[PDB]
Design an enzyme around this catalytic site. Structure first.
Site, short mmCIF file in Angstrom:
data_model
loop_
_atom_site.label_atom_id
_atom_site.label_comp_id
_atom_site.label_asym_id
_atom_site.label_seq_id
_atom_site.Cartn_x
_atom_site.Cartn_y
_atom_site.Cartn_z
N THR A 1 0.85 -1.24 0.00
CA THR A 1 0.00 0.00 0.00
C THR A 1 0.86 1.26 0.00
O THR A 1 1.96 1.28 0.54
CB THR A 1 -1.01 0.00 1.19
N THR B 1 -2.63 0.25 -3.89
CA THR B 1 -2.02 -1.01 -3.41
C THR B 1 -1.89 -2.13 -4.44
O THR B 1 -2.78 -2.30 -5.25
CB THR B 1 -2.81 -1.62 -2.23
N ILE B 2 -0.79 -2.90 -4.35
CA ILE B 2 -0.64 -4.18 -5.06
C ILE B 2 -0.63 -5.33 -4.08
O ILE B 2 -0.28 -6.46 -4.41
CB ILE B 2 0.62 -4.28 -5.99
N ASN B 3 -1.05 -5.01 -2.86
CA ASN B 3 -1.11 -5.90 -1.74
C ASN B 3 0.27 -6.22 -1.10
O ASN B 3 0.86 -5.32 -0.49
CB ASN B 3 -2.00 -7.11 -2.00
N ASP C 1 -6.57 -11.03 -0.49
CA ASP C 1 -7.32 -10.25 0.50
C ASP C 1 -8.69 -10.90 0.71
O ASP C 1 -9.42 -10.55 1.64
CB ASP C 1 -7.52 -8.80 0.03
N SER D 1 -10.88 -4.46 2.32
CA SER D 1 -9.61 -3.77 2.48
C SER D 1 -9.55 -3.01 3.81
O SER D 1 -10.60 -2.55 4.32
CB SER D 1 -9.44 -2.79 1.33
N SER D 2 -8.34 -2.87 4.34
CA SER D 2 -8.07 -2.02 5.51
C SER D 2 -7.91 -0.54 5.19
O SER D 2 -7.90 0.28 6.09
CB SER D 2 -6.81 -2.51 6.22
N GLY E 1 -0.86 -2.69 5.38
CA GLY E 1 -1.72 -3.85 5.59
C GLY E 1 -2.80 -3.61 6.62
O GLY E 1 -3.56 -2.64 6.55
C1 LIG Z 1 0.15 -2.52 0.39
C2 LIG Z 1 -1.08 -2.30 1.35
O1 LIG Z 1 -0.56 -2.02 2.66
C3 LIG Z 1 -1.94 -3.58 1.40
C4 LIG Z 1 -3.30 -3.28 2.01
C5 LIG Z 1 -4.28 -4.48 1.92
N1 LIG Z 1 -4.23 -5.12 0.59
C6 LIG Z 1 -5.70 -3.91 2.09
O2 LIG Z 1 -6.19 -3.91 3.25
O3 LIG Z 1 -6.25 -3.44 1.07
CL LIG Z 2 2.83 5.34 1.90
#
Ligand SMILES: *C[C@](*)(O)CC[C@H](N)C(=O)O
Ligand SMILES: [Cl-]
Ligand SMILES: *[C@@H]1O[C@H](CO)[C@@H](O)[C@H](O)[C@H]1NC(C)=O
Ligand SMILES: *[C@@H]1O[C@H](CO)[C@@H](O)[C@H](O)[C@H]1NC(C)=O
Ligand SMILES: *[C@@H]1O[C@H](CO)[C@@H](O)[C@H](O)[C@H]1NC(C)=O
Ligand SMILES: *[C@@H]1O[C@H](CO)[C@@H](O)[C@H](O)[C@H]1NC(C)=O
Ligand SMILES: *[C@@H]1O[C@H](CO)[C@@H](O)[C@H](O)[C@H]1NC(C)=O
Ligand SMILES: *[C@@H]1O[C@H](CO)[C@@H](O)[C@H](O)[C@H]1NC(C)=O
Ligand SMILES: [Cl-]
Ligand code: NA
Lengths: 343, 189
Positions: free
Chosen positions: B1, B19-21, B43, B71-72, B94
């Site tokens: 993210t 994000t690319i996760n 996710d 997503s967070s 994350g």
């Molecule tokens: C790179 C990001 O921190 C990942 C976040 C996660 N995929 C989400 O909660 O969307």
């Molecule tokens: Cl950042």
């Protein structure tokens, strides 16, 4: 140097990208143009975090109309995807099968169509230069490269750009991204259509499929960024907070803050160790009550979340959870009533 | 993210999280286009996979064709009653994103910390499952004591907890900060 600015500001996780945002503003870009220009850059300098192979959400506020909006451009499961497609964590984390349909470029396009002031090509220009010339590797990227050294060094297609003499780049060493520079150039001239339904598409599909994926040309042709005209808000004193609802975590954020607002935190809440420790204890407990309800959330187009969300942004509901926070102890998991199904 | 925050001269604002996760996504890079592909499929919740020890799957978040995974992320804008932006904020990292975004808001709005302090201030995290409070390496150790005596089991994060970029309106203008945990720096005029 103090980073207080009279007129405008860009806060990004790389100095070079905040600067690229700033110049966009200076040349007459809206806040959206600047965000897009800076994001394209961050996708280069912090390539481990984000990029055109991923997804995004933007929260946008217009000071003139006083309206907030949200652009949802997050990835979606391919059309050939299904609930039991993975049988280990490793299957969901590595290779082409783990790839969701990227939304990033459609998101930039929608945001730009609604709010852009600079030409599309201009937003790509400084990032094309940067990817071609190269840049010293930053603190964040160098730590990510270290963390995942084994996988990078054993995968020749990543080692191609992320190594020097077969070992991961370290902080200060030069990173160049010549293929991405060309892809950015194509996007800048042909627009977003090049990615979704144009000259890059068949190569995208071929790369994902060669690594075991199931994304098809149809998936890409069909992807749509979504405008959300009424984002989640909550009231906090004399302010309002705008944030994305599900599938994002604005409702968790809203619940944490609504729990805590009834304690009336101020400077005094952290002035002595006795107050400070109780205050942080209350913060952790509100985290735990709010994460309890999180497991009921999902994509609202597939899952009915309207009552879950109405609870999580209700002040009265939050006062109910607040009254169950004990000042002298934390509790076991079941106490917070985590739920996996609606009553 | 990655998160970024923008305020323009007319007072308009953007809070953008992307994000690319995981780090480097799926680890699939195109040799032709150079695109690094996300692994956002991870996710989603799966009926099969063991999530953690005793963390079950969430049926609201199972894979369906055309569905988006939970997503967070939470890019936020705070606006005052007079219609002027007060704060533009969000986080990366994350599952610690929502908690760190909350902390930055708490720190600035209620504790009265200036924006750089609110970004740099040590953080802590608890997400219920797993059942542990993670604290940053330089947290006030009186806070660690206050948590332990209230029966929290804490542990120290090997690296750091999240990354926050923030802009806050002040009488002096727009105060900006990027998180030194990642090495960013703001720019403006
Ligand atoms: C790179 C990001 O921190 C990942 C976040 C996660 N995929 C989400 O909660 O969307
Ligand atoms: Cl950042
Ligand atoms: C896992 O098992 C399911 C059901 O048996 C199957 O359809 C699927 O192809 C498997 N997935 C992988 C990645 O092996
Ligand atoms: C905000 O809305 C006004 C009036 O509808 C419009 O003229 C302007 O383009 C918008 N501002 C931005 C930054 O998009
Ligand atoms: C572009 O879109 C059309 C549908 O309008 C489709 O038939 C065609 O296959 C697409 N081209 C590419 C390269 O994906
Ligand atoms: C906040 O959201 C509520 C519920 O959707 C809505 O009634 C109200 O108009 C919103 N407030 C603002 C300031 O946008
Ligand atoms: C909403 O909250 C009330 C208690 O205030 C409760 O009765 C109801 O079950 C909740 N609904 C959901 C879907 O969680
Ligand atoms: C979680 O941690 C708390 C804090 O000590 C403790 O009460 C509890 O027994 C732990 N385990 C569970 C299953 O809640
Ligand atoms: Cl490249
Ligand atoms: Na600063």
């Amino acid at each position: 140097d103090n980073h207080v600015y009279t007129r405008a500001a860009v806060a990004a996780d790389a100095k070079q990208c905040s600067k690229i945002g700033r110049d966009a503003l200076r040349d007459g870009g809206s806040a959206v143009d600047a965000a897009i220009a800076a994001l394209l850059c961050v996708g280069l300098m912090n390539a481990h975090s984000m990029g055109i192979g991923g997804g995004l959400f933007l929260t946008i506020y217009n000071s003139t109309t006083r309206k907030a909006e949200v652009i949802n451009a997050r990835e979606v499961a391919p059309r050939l995807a299904f609930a039991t497609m993975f049988n280990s964590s490793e299957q969901s984390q590595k290779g082409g099968l783990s790839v969701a349909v990227p939304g990033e470029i459609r998101g930039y396009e929608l945001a730009h169509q609604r709010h852009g002031r600079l030409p599309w090509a201009r937003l790509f220009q400084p990032s094309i230069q940067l990817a071609r010339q190269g840049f010293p590797v930053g603190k964040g990227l160098a730590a990510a490269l270290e963390n995942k050294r084994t996988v990078i060094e054993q995968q020749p297609v990543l080692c191609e750009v992320f190594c020097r003499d077969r070992k991961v780049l370290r902080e200060g060493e030069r990173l160049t991204l010549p293929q991405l520079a060309d892809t950015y150039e194509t996007l800048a001239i042909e627009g977003a259509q090049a990615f979704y339904n144009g000259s890059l598409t068949a190569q995208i599909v071929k790369d994902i499929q060669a690594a075991g994926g199931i994304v098809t040309a149809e998936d890409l042709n069909n992807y749509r960024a979504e405008l959300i005209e009424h984002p989640l808000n909550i009231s906090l004193g004399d302010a309002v907070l705008y944030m994305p609802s599900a599938p994002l975590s604005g409702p968790v954020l809203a619940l944490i803050l609504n729990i805590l607002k009834g304690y009336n935190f101020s400077r005094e809440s952290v002035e002595s160790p006795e107050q400070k420790g109780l205050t942080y204890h209350r913060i952790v407990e509100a985290f735990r009550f709010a994460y309890a309800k999180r497991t009921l959330l999902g994509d609202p187009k597939f899952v009915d979340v309207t009552e879950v969300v109405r609870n999580m942004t209700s002040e009265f509901f939050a006062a109910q959870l607040r009254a169950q926070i004990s000042d002298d102890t934390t509790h076991p998991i079941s106490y917070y009533k985590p739920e996996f199904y609606t009553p | 993210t990655a998160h970024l925050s923008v305020v323009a001269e007319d007072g308009s604002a953007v809070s953008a999280t992307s994000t690319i996760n995981l780090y480097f996504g799926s680890k699939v890079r195109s040799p032709v286009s150079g695109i690094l592909f996300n692994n956002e499929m991870d996710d989603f919740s799966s009926p099969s996979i063991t999530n953690e020890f005793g963390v079950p799957p969430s049926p609201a978040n199972f894979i369906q064709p055309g569905k988006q995974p939970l997503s967070s992320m939470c890019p936020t804008i705070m606006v005052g009653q007079d219609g002027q932006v007060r704060m533009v904020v969000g986080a990366a990292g994350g599952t610690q994103i929502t908690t760190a975004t909350a902390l930055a808001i708490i720190y600035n709005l209620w504790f009265g910390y200036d924006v750089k302090r609110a970004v740099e201030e040590p953080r802590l995290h608890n997400q219920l499952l797993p059942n542990v409070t993670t604290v940053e390496r330089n947290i006030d150790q009186a806070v660690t004591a206050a948590l332990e005596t209230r029966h929290h089991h804490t542990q120290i994060a090997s690296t750091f907890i999240a990354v926050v970029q923030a802009i806050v309106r002040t009488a002096g203008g727009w105060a900006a900060a990027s998180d030194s945990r990642k090495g960013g720096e703001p720019a403006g005029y």
